[PDB]
């Protein structure tokens, strides 16, 4: 390997002489302490190194050794239930070793090198192997982890270690070429992991939210953005998805979070339960926790590390969900880096390649036929934070052009304490067309039409609000007041959710469909009544209204009866009306 | 016929690479860059002197080291192998098939930068294209030889209209009534920075309605190299000009999301520390876009045509 | 309101262009200082 | 619909591709079998001369040991060194005086650089 | 110690030294001139050819013939001890109070290490600042970073000094209650004038708040590098006490605008291309390395709290310094010039103010059960009052309903008795009593955000308790 | 209808076989041309 | 060179009512016609070229469309000259440098056109020099200045843009030629802000 010595230290910039042979963007360990950095320039027998950590205390002459590889993650057993920084450092183990502070230059391995794993081989000697195949399985909590062959590897099996407990470092398989395949492999974070094909999404990413799972769906393998002003309600929705989503694995990336905001996730998540299995949620989660005081390089690399891990779990056959919290923070870190390289700003101080990076991040999502021959998907939900709350920000504009679903959180709704704050006028979903077959084939062919009916009611309410502004709702005629009342019902009892509530935090597809049909049937019966010539004012008293109101909080197992009771009460309360 | 390799690499910094003993590399040449791992990256000569030559690596320069990296020449000027059998095929923006069928046997190799049409050699556009859209066909008529962009917005359905025109564009020889029979029509589709979703949509539409047989597609994704976006419209227009003025074809070029092209242009311009313009865009963007657009027209004595419909999205309307 | 917003956007853009020009001048003076140091120390 | 015609066209393209790949394989195999005939020294000598011509200030020549007995005379004639190397067959490479430049003349390289036009020629001849 | 003499360049704040390849980057040096006077400096760039030293103070008498440089320490370190309580330092640790230098228990690096995210614990206990607008409506919670945004002519200094003089913990309210726990105030002043210096000294001395506080005072005419170092020194003392001697420390940073201006000037001196608006591209990270040093750790009973004070350059909240501070911090307290010119002190405007971690620190077992609802009701009532107040100027009082006039009187009484407390120190209990005495002015039932239990328990108290003697 | 698609498939297979048969008669000439061209 | 510059006192009849009545231009005068795209600069200037009372018209296509040059080429031969009956093109000189032709050729073409106009002025005629876009000339200057690595003044343009424009527009005027006759060059330069 290439080893040199420092020529010059100026801030986080270091020049090392004797590095002839060092590759661009390789990771180097600078100084006696072992401070890490990347090569950003080469000039003859010199290499310019950006040190992630502080360089105070360095002197000229100190050694500099090149790792030889770009920034890469260690992929293998042990990621799940793990808390990392943005460059895959296990924070828990660093604490175990160093106390409460992260001393500069500590090196800890991403995958525990001391743990054993029940290795159950799948290949046999003499077998041919290609990138992505499964050599053998390793149990990891409730999953069967698959020891994939690295994508860029080829050959024929010479030796396979028999069944037993082995550490990750053991050469579980040896090729005729002599190459050793262990339980883990390293992959650069900026290179997308190859797949055999990429498919058009066809199944929903059920997030356990009525508004999202009904009006603005996102597909398994789609991309969604969830912007909003401060206190809009984007972190809470990120967490709600992480808690109840339909994903087999969840990768949560906090890129520039506040210290106490990160403590919230770190302390809350271990207690939560998993719906599918009932065990701890963390057993299906990988947390990347970067705070605003961690080096800029780690914050920049957070999203790439997360996407690489998610892609790995995809290639294992699972379906993954990646939540990037405040990608505005990652954009700011990118801007700071570009400034440190003295680049020319484009637009609001951002580099002219921000859109390219956002694309290299979001375009990695998608449903694929992995190299191994199994279907996997990666879905990305990234949050944005316009500075002034205006979607004119370059980050938001660049995101729009690539995301398939837009979940607009409105500050006006938030000030009214309307949670979720998802403005239905500004939100949109381009998957809504392609997901109809799933709904039709799973519950009923009438679900899409009921959805369109609810949307049409919302639009009609939107139009009349100009009238209701000039005059109180009571002045409007029967038809207008009826649509306004059904709109109030729809909003407050179908579009509103409380993440904190014990029972209202989750909703299933059949339950949401039932509430839709309940509201629409009530609306139809009220229309019939108004045609018959009854006063709408009589409608306001019917206890069926309270029946609708409580339909949010009813438990899942309790609904299949509450719905039939509500339907019967819908029939009776109106027919019995004069 | 031989290969010459230069190994006097003296400086790698971002998207640039300096080669010392490079007095035989012409300006604007295309070169290959060979690293220790063996993989080859394409570069272009953007500045040449007696001291050294400056090469702009088409992709990021991760993995390049001065000890092992070498630069070999590909060709003096960028060229594209054109043939009449490109119809009904898909490519990737650097001219490589992405439809699974084998590569095309080149009939010619024409420069992708093209050459200006002599104003004396043009003729006035005079014939009507039936886009199938009433407002366009009645109040904003498109003429064979015209460049008529669609100014779209943030969320407006530009892609839908592009595909609809691709399906429905027709020449309508009957109304002309000059006695000749039906004439050939083709569509060259250039997609820059298109998401996988939109790529699937475009393929679905072209293959569903059967316009693919009469179409050439140059698709560039948003996760592809930036400079492959700059070359997409030039290759598309090279095929268009080839067909129009060597096979009497009527080609309708539809460039989608020129906004992406200008963004990639800004990135490449800011790569080489050039003075910026109105909003960070290069001060030569007028000339660059003119180079792309002015390749439309109808020439004298030839019965082909090239019509461009540049579809762009206006930032913040 | 739309008019005042248009004025605000125009002023922001002109100010940002001025900032870009100043950054260009600063980069050039830094490069020239590097040249002087290289040729004269 | 015309999907049947599309099937026919794609089948024709696939068949022509198979023919061209067969041509490539035959050509490369024949080239690799060329050194079995006694005429390979002369072509390599001419190729080395052309490479030297491509380097006005050439300084060295490189080839496999079996090539040296024929190229030593030329090196003496052209005034350059020559050392054995595990280099490519069917050709000779050089080095510039500064040492930073190189030129290679393996017949496989010539085949690679000429295939662009050879493909069109063979396609025209075949059909 | 070794001495270097190869001075080859002296311009502005920078001098170049030859053969000085043993100087460590960031090392602190001493420049001795021909007269024996000594100036401090910092190594900002180390190379084989030479080292660049940023000289504090000024270079009014240096020369390339007699000047000499020497090493003071490889890294800036501060001797920290529990004996600093009650002492005044200049900004780089040098005492300015005339008493003998301290005896260090240990010398810690100024650039503290990042806290491990997994080592922190959620804030859960509150600090009583004695100011109703904070304790009641924008509570301050231990381990929080809550700034005070101010304007050019507003009294930020007075509020800072009052909070320092009045801040305390309330263990007796903590669950079943507790007697006492340690508390200290580390006060950092950056770029303050002689007038502000005298004000701070007199206020900390005349009330005894000095005995429980450490003062760092960097003046405007003092070096800028000392200004950059002052906040880090204060936070070093704060972390030492809080996490090695179980102190609840309240850190006040007097002017972060001055800090950012000095950071900008320093960066320009080192030939660094600015970012947006001329400020360094790494200002976000520097402000994070300062602000993020507060918090609360798991397994330790100490805490560190920050109240940065930022004077917005042109009342502009969009200015980079307030924007970045808002990204990194957990709320803001806004002073309003209208309330200042109206004669209200402290002029804290409730409507634009916030405290993100307020919910954690207030509730059953911490303050009172009605704290949240009282705060919410006060906010909504005050907002309605300000709106109606604008409307009256057009429509007059007569045409308003009775409820609208009640809201008007509520807004006036709020500004007069709750926001305007003066220098009076208010426990949380008195603050909530005033809040209820004011809310009682509105009729029950209009208080939609307060549960019926609390309304029944506290409603109806006479307004005269505060109206009779403000 | 499926009958027309099957007929087209048969036509395509016949076309491919015809292409191969036509090619085989002259592949040697093409190889000779290529070898003569590439050689110095 | 010229013997003397005179004071313009005879209108330059454009044929356009708004220009000819409200905002006239004298025979030796200078005019600027700025406007955004689609405003009507090329149509206005071609209308000037078709119907003006100038003896000779020198149309300079400085960095504009080639269609706008072929339109002149194809149509002007079949239009009738207002003041001599002959084909219109017989009184016209076309300088064409399309958008995608070289860049410095624009700087060349402006001077070439003004020199040709000055020549025909020295022949005793009255000439109209329609410059299709001075903005593209400014852009070409900016590009070359960037190549020289100079300091831009505003928006990147070299600080001597104003001096060059002043010279170009100051070539115009009604003069007594060196030969004792009288001539005039009129410049109507479009700007593409
Ligand atoms: N679904 C919800 N259920 C209950 N309360 C909610 C909900 N959404 C938002 N809130 C309330 O609004 C607050 C908004 O906080 P949140 O962390 O979601 O903000 P954010 O939009 O991510 O803002 P920031 O940019 O500050 O991170 C929540 O703390 C909670 O008080
Ligand atoms: N006087 C006019 N009478 C009728 N139509 C006109 C007139 N002036 C302009 N137009 C219309 O405006 C269109 C554009 O005019 P013109 O060619 O003069 O544009 P321009 O201002 O030179 O713009 P650009 O910047 O694109 O070159 C013309 O095609 C014609 O449709
Ligand atoms: Mg025009």
Author numbering:
A (entry chain B): 1 to 578
B (entry chain E): 3 to 319
C (entry chain G): 169 to 209
D (entry chain J): 61 to 187
E (entry chain D): 5 to 474
F (entry chain I): 81 to 120
G (entry chain C): 194 to 386
Quote the study that presented this structure, word for word:
Vacuolar/archaeal-type ATPase (V/A-ATPase) is a rotary ATPase that shares a common rotary catalytic mechanism with FoF1 ATP synthase. The thermophilic bacterium Thermus thermophilus (Tth) possesses V/A-ATPase, which functions as an ATP synthase in vivo. In the V/A-ATPase, the V1 domain (A3B3D1F1) can function as an ATP-driven rotary motor and ATP binding, ATP hydrolysis, and ADP/Pi release that occur simultaneously at three catalytic sites of A3B3, respectively. This cooperative reaction produces conformational changes in the A3B3 stator, which induces a 120° rotation of the central DF rotor.
After 3D masked classification with a mask containing ABsemi, two structures were obtained from the resulting dataset of the 30 s reaction mixture. In another structure reconstructed from 19 K particles, ATP or ADP occupied all three catalytic sites. The structure of the V/A-ATPase containing three nucleotides referred as V3ATP was identical to V3nuc obtained under saturating ATP conditions in our previous study. Two maps of V2ATP and V3ATP showed an apparent density for ATP binding to each catalytic site on ABsemi when contoured at 7σ (standard deviation). The atomic displacement (B) factor of ATP binding to ABsemi in the V2ATP and V3ATP was in the range of 30 to 59 and 41 to 77 Å2, respectively, although Vsemi1ATP showed a higher B factor range of 112 to 133 Å2. The V3ATP is likely derived from V2nuc, where ABopen is empty. Nevertheless, our results indicated that V2SO4 and Vsemi1ATP finally transformed to V3ATP (ATP/ADP occupies all three AB) by sequential binding of ATP to the catalytic sites.
